Amino acid sequence: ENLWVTVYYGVPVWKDAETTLFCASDAKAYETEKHNVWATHACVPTDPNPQEIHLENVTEEFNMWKNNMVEQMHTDIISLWDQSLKPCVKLTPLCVTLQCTNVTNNITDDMRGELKNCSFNMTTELRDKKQKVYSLFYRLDVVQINSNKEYRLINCNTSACTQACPKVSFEPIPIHYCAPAGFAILKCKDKKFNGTGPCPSVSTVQCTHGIKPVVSTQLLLNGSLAEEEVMIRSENITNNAKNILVQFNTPVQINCTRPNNNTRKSIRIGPGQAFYATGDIIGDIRQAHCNVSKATWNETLGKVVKQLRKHFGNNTIIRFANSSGGDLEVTTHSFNCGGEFFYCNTSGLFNSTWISNNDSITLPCRIKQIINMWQRIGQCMYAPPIQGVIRCVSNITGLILTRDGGSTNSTTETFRPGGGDMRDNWRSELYKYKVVKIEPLGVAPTRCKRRV
Amino acid sequence: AVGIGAVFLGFLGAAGSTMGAASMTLTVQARNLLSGTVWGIKQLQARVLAVERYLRDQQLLGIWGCSGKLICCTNVPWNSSWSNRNLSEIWDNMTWLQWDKEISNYTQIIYGLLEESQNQQEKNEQDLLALD
Amino acid sequence: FLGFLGAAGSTMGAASMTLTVQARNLLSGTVWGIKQLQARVLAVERYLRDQQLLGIWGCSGKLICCTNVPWNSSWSNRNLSEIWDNMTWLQWDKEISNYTQIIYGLLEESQNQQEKNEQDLLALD
Amino acid sequence: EVKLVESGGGLVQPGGSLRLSCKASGFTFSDFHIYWFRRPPGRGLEWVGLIRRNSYTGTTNYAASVEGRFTISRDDSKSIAYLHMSSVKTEDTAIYYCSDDEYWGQGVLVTVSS
Amino acid sequence: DIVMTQTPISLPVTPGEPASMSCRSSQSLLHSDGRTYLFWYLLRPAQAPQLLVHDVSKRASGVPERFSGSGSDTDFTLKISRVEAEDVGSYYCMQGTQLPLTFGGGTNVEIK
Ligand SMILES: *[C@@H]1O[C@H](CO)[C@@H](O)[C@H](O)[C@H]1NC(C)=O
Ligand SMILES: *[C@@H]1O[C@H](CO)[C@@H](O)[C@H](O)[C@H]1NC(C)=O
Ligand SMILES: *[C@@H]1O[C@H](CO)[C@@H](O)[C@H](O)[C@H]1NC(C)=O
Ligand SMILES: *[C@@H]1O[C@H](CO)[C@@H](O)[C@H](O)[C@H]1NC(C)=O
Ligand SMILES: *[C@@H]1O[C@H](CO)[C@@H](O)[C@H](O)[C@H]1NC(C)=O
Ligand SMILES: *[C@@H]1O[C@H](CO)[C@@H](O)[C@H](O)[C@H]1NC(C)=O
Ligand SMILES: *[C@@H]1O[C@H](CO)[C@@H](O)[C@H](O)[C@H]1NC(C)=O
Ligand SMILES: *[C@@H]1O[C@H](CO)[C@@H](O)[C@H](O)[C@H]1NC(C)=O
Ligand SMILES: *[C@@H]1O[C@H](CO)[C@@H](O)[C@H](O)[C@H]1NC(C)=O
Ligand SMILES: *[C@@H]1O[C@H](CO)[C@@H](O)[C@H](O)[C@H]1NC(C)=O
Numbered sequence: 061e062n063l064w065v066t067v068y069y070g071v072p073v074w075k076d077a078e079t080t081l082f083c084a085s086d087a088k089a090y091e092t093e094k095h096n097v098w099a100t101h102a103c104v105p106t107d108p109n110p111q112e113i114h115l116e117n118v119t120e121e122f123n124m125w126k127n128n129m130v131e132q133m134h135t136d137i138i139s140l141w142d143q144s145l146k147p148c149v150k151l152t153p154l155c156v157t158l159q160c161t162n163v164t165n166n167i168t169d170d171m172r173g174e175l176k177n178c179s180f181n182m183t184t185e186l187r188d189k190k191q192k193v194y195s196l197f198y199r200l201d202v203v204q205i206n207s208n209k210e211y212r213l214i215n216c217n218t219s220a221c222t223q224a225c226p227k228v229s230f231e232p233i234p235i236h237y238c239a240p241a242g243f244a245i246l247k248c249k250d251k252k253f254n255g256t257g258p259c260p261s262v263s264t265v266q267c268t269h270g271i272k273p274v275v276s277t278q279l280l281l282n283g284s285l286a287e288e289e290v291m292i293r294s295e296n297i298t299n300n301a302k303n304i305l306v307q308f309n310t311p312v313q314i315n316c317t318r319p320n321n322n323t324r325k326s327i328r329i330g331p332g333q334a335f336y337a338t339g340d341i342i343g344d345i346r347q348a349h350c351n352v353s354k355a356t357w358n359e360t361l362g363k364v365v366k367q368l369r370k371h372f373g374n375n376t377i378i379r380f381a382n383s384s385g386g387d388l389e390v391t392t393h394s395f396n397c398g399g400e401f402f403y404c405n406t407s408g409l410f411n412s413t414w415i416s417n418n419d420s421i422t423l424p425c426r427i428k429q430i431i432n433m434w435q436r437i438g439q440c441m442y443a444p445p446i447q448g449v450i451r452c453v454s455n456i457t458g459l460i461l462t463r464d465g466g467s468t469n470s471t472t473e474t475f476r477p478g479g480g481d482m483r484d485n486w487r488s489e490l491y492k493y494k495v496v497k498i499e500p501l502g503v504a505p506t507r508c509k510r511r512v
Numbered sequence: 513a514v515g516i517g518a519v520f521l522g523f524l525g526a527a528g529s530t531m532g533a534a535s536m537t538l539t540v541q542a543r544n545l546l547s548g549t550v551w552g553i554k555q556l557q558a559r560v561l562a563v564e565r566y567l568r569d570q571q572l573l574g575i576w577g578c579s580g581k582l583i584c585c586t587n588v589p590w591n592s593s594w595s596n597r598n599l600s601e602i603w604d605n606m607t608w609l610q611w612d613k614e615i616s617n618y619t620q621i622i623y624g625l626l627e628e629s630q631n632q633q634e635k636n637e638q639d640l641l642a643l644d
Numbered sequence: 645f646l647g648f649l650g651a652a653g654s655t656m657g658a659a660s661m662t663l664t665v666q667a668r669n670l671l672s673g674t675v676w677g678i679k680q681l682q683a684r685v686l687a688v689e690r691y692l693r694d695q696q697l698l699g700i701w702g703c704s705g706k707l708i709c710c711t712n713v714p715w716n717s718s719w720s721n722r723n724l725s726e727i728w729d730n731m732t733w734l735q736w737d738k739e740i741s742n743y744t745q746i747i748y749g750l751l752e753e754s755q756n757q758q759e760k761n762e763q764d765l766l767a768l769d
Numbered sequence: 770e771v772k773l774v775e776s777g778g779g780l781v782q783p784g785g786s787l788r789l790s791c792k793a794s795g796f797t798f799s800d801f802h803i804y805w806f807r808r809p810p811g812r813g814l815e816w817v818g819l820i821r822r823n824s825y826t827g828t829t830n831y832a833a834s835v836e837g838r839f840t841i842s843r844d845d846s847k848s849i850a851y852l853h854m855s856s857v858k859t860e861d862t863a864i865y866y867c868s869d870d871e872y873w874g875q876g877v878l879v880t881v882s883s
Numbered sequence: 884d885i886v887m888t889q890t891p892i893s894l895p896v897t898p899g900e901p902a903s904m905s906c907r908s909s910q911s912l913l914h915s916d917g918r919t920y921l922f923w924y925l926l927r928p929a930q931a932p933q934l935l936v937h938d939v940s941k942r943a944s945g946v947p948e949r950f951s952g953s954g955s956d957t958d959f960t961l962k963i964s965r966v967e968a969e970d971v972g973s974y975y976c977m978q979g980t981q982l983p984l985t986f987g988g989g990t991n992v993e994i995k
């Protein structure tokens with residue numbers, strides 16, 4: 061037959077690519093006076109109507125472990141945190157010699173030597189004068205430089221870091237990510253998706269759902285639940301050096317408190333600059349804790365062990381242990397509760413060995429004020445004290461496990477909690493999304509000739 | 513006869529249809545190519561890169577004989593060594609995504625000297641006009 | 645192959661066959677963070693203005709376009725014989741440069757503005 | 770003048786088949802979508818089906834209650850739309866209308882009984 | 884889907900007094916092409932249906948300078964100024980911005 065070349069502009073053809081995605085915020089964040097860390101005025105709010113177009117007879121291949129969509133989010137989250145520590149006070153004159161003594165007024169034995177009462181000399185608004193003030197410090201913030209003994213802050217040989225602005229809040233808010241012109245976002249609507257592999261139900265969305273930037277270790281808090289069963293997702297299930305991401309289907313309610321009420325005392329260290337110290341605790345001194353139900357934790361741990369046997373064998377013994385070692389940020393469950401940073405001991409949660417065939421668990425927690433985040437060296441931040449009693453309620457919606465290893469796979473396998481890089485916390489949310497580039501020009505044979 | 517918006521296949525809504533049916537929905541994907549310190553330059557750079565990339569396709573359509581047109585046919589012959597197939601198994605049993613991976617390593621020959629035959633149609637036309 | 649600006653010293657008869665080479669080279673793709681971002685915008689705006697000017701005439705998407713304006717304003721004082729075979733494009737711009745603002749207005753009023761009006765009043769019937 | 774006439778109604782057994790036919794005149798039948806509606810006795814209007822024009826992929830969309838059982842086809846030669854109903858239940862008694870989003874038809878009564 | 888609520892159900896109207904009805908939607912009716920799809924249908928007894936007002940507040944064919952509608956989003960009203968004897972029947976509001984096409988409840992108008 062007589063066949064000529066005919067061009068078409070606007071064909072539905074796409075290929076994988078990488079780009080820069082902008083925000084989409086809600087109307088609640090449009091009316092803010094106490095500006096959040098993740099606040100607005102940097103990127104546009106959204107429209108109240110999502111646009112989801114279902115694509116039929118389309119099969120696409122996804123891969124959550126090589127997604128560029130989770131590496132831009134980390135950069136954006138780090139960049140929005142350094143942009144809120146600029147306008148408020150830098151605590152450079154705090155690197156002095158501290159004269160600290162123990163406090164034993166109304167303490168209870170474990171809070172024996174956790175709190176320290178320290179006195180020091182501080183500058184005032186006039187350069188010719190100095191003032192003698194005092195403050196309460198935790199034991200995890202002060203070291204000894206060699207009972208009135210001489211102490212110093214733990215950061216005085218690395219950097220002098222800024223105080224946290226006393227008006228901002230650390231409460232996460234949802235953030236939607238949208239695609240630019242010429243690109244598209246593909247969403248996998250399969251219910252038993254496991255990350256790597258083809259997805260037979262693909263739909264096109266305009267912007268993603270609200271992903272709350274919740275920072276936590278060894279446990280995923282306030283996440284998204286599964287729909288059918290628990291999900292175990294790993295890049296390589298045979299390699300023991302890769303973390304295992306478990307997703308729950310029913311939440312486990314965790315609920316913590318800081319029992320003693322503090323008083324915030326303001327100290328003027330310069331012209332227009334203030335330092336918020338700790339005053340006196342009214343009442344008794346008792347430890348902070350977290351409480352998990354003993355019966356609900358059993359149900360959500362007997363289901364993980366059921367689907368962990370589908371990859372390792374039906375006649376193997378699965379054992380749970382606690383973390384091995386490292387610094388305090390990887391061996392403990394760390395989170396933010398109302399402005400105070402907790403470091404809880406999750407050693408009674410994983411204390412079970414499973415055979416093939418009104419009660420609560422109390423987890424002791426510790427509080428710190430000089431913190432280093434995102435594994436960076438030389439940039440700390442001082443969290444000011446919170447006045448009153450703090451209580452928060454959260455949902456546990458997943459775990460980050462790590463297999464130990466060793467031979468004799470059919471005999472025993474031990475799983476212990478993991479943590480570290482925060483890119484695995486946001487990889488559990490952006491696992492069904494993918495960015496593609498539209499290519500609209502193509503040719504095809506047709507019986508149309510020119511010279512009409 | 514006034515219009516209902518429910519009969520509207522959206523963006524990429526004909527991506528699973530055959531080639532003969534997805535060819536009537538080109539405007540939907542055609543109109544989306546031109547829509548709208550730190551963290552204020554990368555967006556501007558992306559917008560500038562998106563503007564200069566759409567122009568490189570309109571310039572490529574400037575040559576050949578397809579200017580301001582979405583469906584345009586030329587007079588370049590097709591040999592059987594490109595895709596030996598009938599017209600009843602390309603336009604009725606194949607998707608535009610499946611066609612762009614078969615004719616994928618044969619496109620640079622088509623996009624080049626074979627279709628830039630307008631140079632033989634602009635000098636063959638000004639000579640005719642210079643004869644009265 | 646002559647490449648970009650290859651027929652710069654060639655005559656007019658041999659330089660008009662390579663317009664495509666120089667047509668595609670007009671659109672290609674904090675120190676060094678704002679230099680490119682301001683150079684590329686100017687490169688796009690210079691191309692768009694020329695493509696709009698070539699198109700408010702009757703020549704929209706053709707590389708060679710010949711019209712119906714008489715050769716009165718542009719005083720070459722030379723016949724076609726020794727222009728297309730004894731002169732290059734660089735020497736041409738030296739001669740006709742004063743008359744390139746009173747010939748760009750005879751292409752916009754005497755042509756494709758009047759011409760577009762009897763066509764609007766002839767498809768009326 | 771746009772005129773739409775429906776025909777082919779009657780009484781059918783609970784599980785039989787019937788073929789309604791709309792007819793259009795005075796305009797180009799190939800340049801308009803065709804919608805089908807119905808009115809149960811005592812209730813309001815409801816949507817039945819939908820077919821697009823032949824230059825817009827000619828696809829069909831059906832309601833949830835009549836999915837699979839009902840099929841709509843066009844005919845550009847005779848300018849006659851076709852509604853195919855089979856395996857009907859006892860709740861499919863209504864007056865079916867043929868419309869083009871502006872002008873409706875007179876309608877025909879369809880009643881199912883044993 | 885999107886549900887439609889019509890208030891009231893029965894509106895007795897005097898032959899020659901103003902009348903007004905309403906229709907509401909559970910979701911926004913704005914479409915991607917910047918249009919709001921609302922249709923007002925008059926269902927006279929033993930007669931063909933008539934399209935009174937299309938696209939919220941635009942008069943359709945016929946409608947002899949009597950019927951008019953207004954509304955921004957999720958709240959629409961129809962107004963009749965000089966009610967005559969022929970304006971007896973049922974009124975329905977239908978969306979067109981999203982499949983399926985869902986009608987309204989109904990509003991019976993009778994001479995009182
Ligand atoms: C801390 O020491 C100061 C003396 O500098 C004293 O006035 C204050 O009562 C002490 N507070 C506690 C809780 O021991
Ligand atoms: C503050 O300074 C005074 C005298 O300058 C000194 O006696 C006192 O010990 C200092 N307090 C400290 C170092 O805590
Ligand atoms: C994920 O699913 C795909 C196909 O269902 C399979 O090939 C792959 O091995 C699975 N990976 C894991 C870690 O289960
Ligand atoms: C926690 O889970 C409960 C369901 O048990 C839910 O109602 C609540 O909104 C969740 N809290 C979140 C997601 O912050
Ligand atoms: C996964 O790990 C095994 C050993 O643990 C290794 O042999 C293999 O190459 C890894 N990668 C795969 C299966 O893609
Ligand atoms: C704890 O101390 C604060 C002082 O700022 C006081 O306002 C609060 O009432 C105290 N807590 C209780 C339970 O009384
Ligand atoms: C957390 O609070 C909820 C309600 O505020 C309560 O029902 C629950 O028992 C608390 N958690 C624990 C472990 O007691
Ligand atoms: C619940 O967990 C405890 C902790 O080891 C265990 O002793 C007990 O057998 C479990 N009960 C059930 C029903 O799984
Ligand atoms: C493991 O054994 C259980 C026994 O109840 C069985 O139900 C399940 O299907 C088995 N899983 C396999 C064979 O993968
Ligand atoms: C883990 O548990 C063991 C109990 O055998 C304990 O000695 C160790 O300190 C614990 N480690 C951590 C990091 O909790």
Ligand SMILES: *[C@@H]1O[C@H](CO)[C@@H](O)[C@H](O)[C@H]1NC(C)=O
Binds near residue numbers: 391392405407
């Ligand atoms: C946690 O608890 C274990 C045993 O209860 C104890 O050995 C350990 O010191 C505690 N703290 C940490 C940080 O592991």
Ligand SMILES: *[C@@H]1O[C@H](CO)[C@@H](O)[C@H](O)[C@H]1NC(C)=O
Binds near residue numbers: 407408411
């Ligand atoms: C694990 O459980 C046993 C028995 O219930 C208990 O003796 C042991 O202390 C527990 N381990 C930890 C780290 O609390």
Ligand SMILES: *[C@@H]1O[C@H](CO)[C@@H](O)[C@H](O)[C@H]1NC(C)=O
Binds near residue numbers: 115116525
């Ligand atoms: C998918 O393929 C079926 C083939 O029976 C076709 O009817 C349907 O229209 C296709 N989907 C789309 C969105 O075109």
Ligand SMILES: *[C@@H]1O[C@H](CO)[C@@H](O)[C@H](O)[C@H]1NC(C)=O
Binds near residue numbers: 590591592593621
């Ligand atoms: C048809 O054109 C293609 C262009 O790539 C060429 O490979 C093939 O050999 C040609 N067949 C002929 C000239 O018979």
Ligand SMILES: *[C@@H]1O[C@H](CO)[C@@H](O)[C@H](O)[C@H]1NC(C)=O
Binds near residue numbers: 596597598
């Ligand atoms: C195309 O169709 C003809 C008959 O219509 C048949 O003879 C021929 O083999 C077909 N071509 C191919 C490549 O199958």
Ligand SMILES: *[C@@H]1O[C@H](CO)[C@@H](O)[C@H](O)[C@H]1NC(C)=O
Binds near residue numbers: 613614616617
């Ligand atoms: C087209 O040629 C390239 C050459 O690199 C090859 O990789 C590709 O597989 C070829 N396409 C097909 C469909 O064979």
Ligand SMILES: *[C@@H]1O[C@H](CO)[C@@H](O)[C@H](O)[C@H]1NC(C)=O
Binds near residue numbers: 653654655
């Ligand atoms: C360059 O000048 C020489 C000397 O007149 C001439 O012979 C030659 O043809 C010129 N080059 C071209 C490309 O015309």
Ligand SMILES: *[C@@H]1O[C@H](CO)[C@@H](O)[C@H](O)[C@H]1NC(C)=O
Binds near residue numbers: 716
């Ligand atoms: C035509 O040439 C004459 C010669 O001087 C000049 O006066 C006149 O302005 C020219 N026409 C136009 C339109 O420039």
Ligand SMILES: *[C@@H]1O[C@H](CO)[C@@H](O)[C@H](O)[C@H]1NC(C)=O
Binds near residue numbers: 726
């Ligand atoms: C045409 O130009 C030539 C110069 O090559 C000149 O000699 C001749 O006189 C001109 N003819 C007229 C009619 O001006």
Ligand SMILES: *[C@@H]1O[C@H](CO)[C@@H](O)[C@H](O)[C@H]1NC(C)=O
Binds near residue numbers: 741742
């Ligand atoms: C055109 O104008 C410029 C500026 O006045 C002048 O220098 C030039 O000589 C003029 N052109 C001619 C051909 O005289």
